[PDB]
Paper text:
Ribonucleotide reductases (RNRs) are essential metalloenzymes that employ sophisticated radical chemistry to reduce the 2′-OH group of ribonucleotides and thereby produce deoxyribonucleotides (dNTPs), the building blocks of DNA. The class Ib R2 subunit (R2b) metal site can bind two manganese ions or two iron ions. In contrast, the di-manganese R2b form cannot react with O2 but requires a superoxide radical (O2•−) provided by NrdI, a flavoprotein which is generally encoded in the same operon as R2b. NrdI binds tightly to R2b in a 1:1 ratio with FMN at the protein–protein interface, forming a dimer of heterodimers.
The crystals for the first dataset were grown under aerobic conditions, yielding bright orange crystals, indicating that NrdI was fully oxidized. In BcR2bMnMn–NrdIox, the isoalloxazine moiety of FMNox is almost planar, with a butterfly bend of 0.2°. An unknown molecule is bound within 5 Å from the reactive C4a of FMN in BcR2bMnMn–NrdIox, which binds O2 to reduce it to O2•−. The molecule is 3-coordinated to Trp74 (NrdI), Ser196 (R2b), and a water (p-ox in Figure 5D, E). The exact nature of the molecule could not be determined and was thus designated as an unknown atom in the final model. The position of the density in BcR2bMnMn–NrdIox is close to the channel entrance on the R2b surface marked by Lys263, Asn267, and Ser196. In BcR2bMnMn–NrdIox, the two metal ions of R2b are refined at full occupancy and the coordination sphere is clearly defined in the electron density map. Mn1 is 4-coordinated by His96, Glu93, Asp62, and Glu195. Mn2 is 5-coordinated by His198, Glu93, Glu195, and Glu161. The protein complex used in the crystallization for the BcR2bMnMn–NrdIox dataset has not undergone any oxidation of the metal site and both manganese ions are in the Mn(II)/Mn(II) oxidation state.
Numbering used by the authors:
A (entry chain B), D (entry chain B): 1 to 116
B (entry chain A), C (entry chain A): 1 to 299
The structure:
C-alpha cells in the first residue's frame, strides 16, 4: 500500500523514513491511482493543511486510512486533522503520533495498515 | 535601510506564524480564577507550597524570555518578517508572566506573595538555571555577532521554550487533570499553547542558521548543544528533587522532563536522547481544556 | 534574579499603560481597505506618488522602532513592569508596519510595491533621518550603559514617536479629512492612537531618569536634546520639500511638523520651541473617525 | 473663583501655573465649599479620571464649569471628560485645550471664567 504524506517542518518526513514503505510527498498536481494511506501534520486548532485538503478533493476515491502527526500540548486538538478527514471521507483513523513518532508509533502504524 | 515588506515573502514560514500568534492572542482578564479557592483550601500545606514555588519559577523564566531572550535574538536577525514574529512572541512572554500574578492574587495574601518572590530571587538553583540560559543571550549585547553565537542563543531559547518550563508546568497540569485548580489550569494551558509554537518557530530559525555554518562550526555547535542539554538536565534533577520530594512526585516529573527534552531536540531537527515513555495520563487529562479552542479571529 | 511581580507596584504608571495598550489592541484584518479604490483612481499621478512615498517612509520608521528602538531600550531598564509595557509597544510597532502592506496590496500592483521599497531603501534623506535616531539606539548594544546614554535613547524615541512620524501622517489625514481614502485613514488613525500613548510613556520614563542625573549631566543632555531637535527639523524641512512640492502642501506640512515637535517636547516635560499655530482644519477632520472608539475589553 | 484640578503627568499642573489664579489639586478627602471651576485631564477613550469622579460626587454643588486637557490625536474623544461632566452635572464647558495649553488657551480660559 502506498503512503502519501505532507510535511512542513520535517517531522512527518522523518517518520516516513522509519517506515521502509513506498512513499511520496503530495503536491497540487499529484494523482494517485492506487490504494493509499495518508499521513498529514496538524495545523492550528486541529485543522488540515490546505494542500492536503486540495489533494484529497481529487484523490479521495483511493484513500484507505489516515494518520496524523501532532503535539499533545494541543489537548483535544491533538492530531485532529485525522478526525476531520476520517469523518469527511469515512475512512478509519490509522493512528496519531507526536512529531516524528516513537518506535512504538512505527510498529503500531505498520500493524494497523496490515489490519486494513 | 530596509523596511519590512509583507507583499514579498522573506521565508516560507513567517506569515503562517505571524497569523497564528494573533489568532492565539489572549489576556488574563478572560479567565476568572476566583472559583479555584474552593479546591485550593483542600490541598495540604506541602502541596500549596510546591504550587506557589513552581509558579514563581515560571514567572522568572518568562521574565527573562520576554525581557532578554526575544529582544536580543530579534535585534540581530536580518529577516525582517521573522524579526516581527519574535517581537510579538516577546510581548506574549510578558502577558504570560503577568498572568501568574493574576493567579497569586486569588490564592495568597500579599505578604505570602512577597515571600514567594524573595524566595525566587535568592534561590541558588534558579539563579544557576536562569544564569546558564541568559549567558547565551548576553553574549549578543554587542554590535556584531557571529552565526555561531546566534545559533547557540536560539538553542538556549528552544531549550527554555520546549524543555525547561515543563518541570514547572507539570504540577498545575497534574492537579487540573484531577479537577483541582482548574481555572488556573486553563491559564497554564493557554500559556503552553503559546510556548508550543514559540519553540517550533525558534527551532526553524536555528536550523536555517545551522545550514550556513561551516563544517567545523557545525561539529562545534553540535557538541556544545549536547553538553548544554545534559548540563541543564543535571540542574533540573536537583530542582525537581527540591520541589517535589515532599509530595512524592519526583520520578513522575523527571519522566515528564525527559519527554519534553526530546520534543525540544526535535524542534531543532535533532534526534531524541532519552528513552521513549508514555506521558503521565493525569497530566494528559489536564491538557484537555475547552478554552484552548478560542480563536481571536472568529469572535 | 528578580521576577516581575504585578502585585507590588514598581511605579505609579506602568499598570495604567499596560491595560491601555491591550484595550487598544487591533490588527489589520479588522479594516477592509478595498473600497478605497474608488477614490484612489480620482487622485492625480503626483498625489498617488506622494501617498505611496510617505507610506514607505512610515514603514521604515516603524520597522526601526519595533526592531531596534523598543528592544534596546527595554533590555536596559531595571523596572520590570515598565519593561513589560515597552515589549508590548514593540510588538504593536510590528502590527503597524504590517498594516501599511495591507494598504499597499489594495492600491498598487506588486511591481509598484517593490519600486516603492527600493526607493525607500536607497533614499539618502531617509537613510540620514533613520540613521540619526538609530545611532542613539545602537549605543545601547553593550552590557553596561550609562544613565546619560539611556536618557538620550529615550529622547530619540520620543522624537520619533511624537514628531518624526507626523510629516508622513499628515497626508493620509489630509485626504481622509476630504473623504478620500477613508479606509486607509482609519488604519492611520489606529496607528496614531497607539503612537500617542507610546510617546507619553517613554517621556515619563525619560523624566524619571533625568532626575537621577547629576547637575552637570542634566545640562549636557539639555543641550544635546535641543541640538537633536533642531538637527531633525532641518532634515524634516528637506524631506517635506522633496515629498510635497509637487502637490503644493509644503508650508502646511511644515506647520504640522512644528505643532507635533511641540507635543514631543512637552512629553519630555520641556517647554515648546515653536510658535503656536492652529492645526490644519482638514487634518483635524481626518482625525475624527468612529473606529478609534473600539475598546478590546468591551467586545 | 477657585480652580480645582487634577493632573497625572504634569500638563494640567503646568497650565495651572500660567493662570495666576488660586488653585488646589484635588484628593479624595478634599471638600470645597466655595464656587469653583474644575480642570481635569482626559483618560483613555474620552473618560474622566476616577479621582475626579469621586471628588465631584461630594463637591458637585459648588461646581460652576469644567475645562479639560487632552490631545486632539483622540479625534472626537478630544477632551471628552468635559463633555461627560458637563452633561452629568449641567454645568458649561469652559474650554478644551491640548496638553499644557497655548497662551491663547490661557486667555480664552480667563475670559471664559469672567463670563460665568
Ligand atoms: C502553527 C502550528 C499549529 C499547530 N497546531 C496543532 C494542533 O492544533 N494540534 C496538534 O496536534 N498539533 C499542532 N501543531 C504541531 C504539528 O502538527 C507537529 O509539530 C507536526 O509534527 C508537524 O509536522 P511536520 O514537521 O511534518 O510539518 C501545530 C504546529 C504549528 C507550527
Ligand atoms: C493612557 C492615556 C489615554 C489618553 N486618552 C485621551 C483621550 O481619550 N482623549 C484625549 O483628549 N486625551 C487623552 N489623553 C491625553 C491626556 O489627556 C493629555 O496628555 C493631558 O494633557 C494629560 O494631562 P496631565 O499631564 O495633567 O495628566 C490620554 C493620555 C493617556 C496617557
Ligand atoms: Mn511564556
Ligand atoms: Mn515562549
Ligand atoms: Mn508605530
Ligand atoms: Mn510607537
Amino acid at each position: 500500500m502506498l503512503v502519501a504524506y505532507d510535511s512542513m517542518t520535517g517531522n512527518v518526513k522523518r517518520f516516513i523514513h522509519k517506515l521502509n514503505m513506498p512513499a511520496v510527498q503530495i503536491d497540487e498536481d499529484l494523482v494517485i491511482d492506487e490504494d493509499f494511506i495518508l499521513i498529514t501534520y496538524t495545523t492550528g486548532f486541529g485543522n488540515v493543511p490546505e494542500r492536503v485538503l486540495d489533494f484529497l478533493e481529487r484523490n479521495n476515491e483511493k484513500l484507505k486510512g489516515v494518520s496524523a502527526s501532532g503535539n499533545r500540548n494541543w489537548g483535544d486538538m491533538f492530531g485532529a486533522s485525522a478526525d476531520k478527514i476520517s469523518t469527511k471521507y469515512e475512512v478509519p483513523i490509522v493512528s496519531k503520533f507526536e512529531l516524528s513518532g516513537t518506535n512504538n508509533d512505527v510498529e503500531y502504524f505498520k500493524e494497523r495498515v496490515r489490519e486494513i | 535601510m530596509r523596511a519590512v515588506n509583507w507583499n514579498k515573502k522573506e521565508d516560507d514560514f513567517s506569515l503562517m506564524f505571524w497569523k497564528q500568534n494573533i489568532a492565539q492572542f489572549w489576556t488574563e482578564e478572560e479567565i476568572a480564577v476566583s472559583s479555584d479557592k474552593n479546591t485550593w483550601v483542600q490541598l495540604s500545606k506541602e502541596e500549596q507550597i510546591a504550587y506557589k514555588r513552581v509558579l514563581g519559577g515560571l514567572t522568572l523564566l518568562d521574565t527573562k524570555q520576554g525581557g532578554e531572550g526575544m529582544p536580543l535574538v530579534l535585534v540581530h536577525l536580518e529577516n525582517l518578517q521573522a524579526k516581527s514574529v519574535l517581537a510579538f512572541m516577546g510581548a506574549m512572554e510578558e502577558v504570560h508572566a503577568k498572568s501568574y500574578s493574576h493567579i497569586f492574587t486569588t490564592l495568597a495574601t500579599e505578604e505570602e506573595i512577597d515571600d514567594i518572590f524573595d524566595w525566587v530571587d535568592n534561590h541558588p538553583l534558579l539563579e544557576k538555571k536562569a544564569g546558564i540560559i541568559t549567558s547565551y543571550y548576553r553574549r549578543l549585547l554587542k554590535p556584531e555577532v557571529t552565526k555561531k553565537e546566534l545559533y547557540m542563543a536560539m538553542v538556549a531559547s528552544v531549550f527554555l521554550e520546549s524543555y525547561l518550563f515543563y518541570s514547572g508546568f507539570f504540577y498545575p497540569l497534574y492537579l487540573a487533570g484531577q479537577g483541582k485548580l482548574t481555572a488556573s489550569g486553563e491559564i497554564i494551558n493557554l500559556i503552553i499553547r503559546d510556548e508550543s509554537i514559540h519553540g517550533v518557530f525558534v527551532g526553524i530559525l536555528a536550523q536555517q542558521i545551522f545550514a550556513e555554518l561551516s563544517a567545523e562550526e557545525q561539529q562545534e555547535v553540535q557538541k556544545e548543544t549536547q553538553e548544554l542539554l545534559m548540563e541543564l538536565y543535571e540542574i533540573e534533577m536537583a530542582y525537581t528533587e527540591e520541589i517535589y520530594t515532599s509530595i512524592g512526585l519526583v520520578e513522575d516529573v523527571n519522566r515528564f522532563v525527559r519527554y519534553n527534552a526530546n520534543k525540544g531536540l526535535m524542534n531543532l531537527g535533532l534526534e531524541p536522547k532519552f528513552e521513549e515513555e508514555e506521558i503521565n495520563p493525569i497530566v494528559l487529562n489536564g491538557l484537555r481544556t475547552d478554552t484552548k479552542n478560542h480563536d481571536f479571529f472568529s469572535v
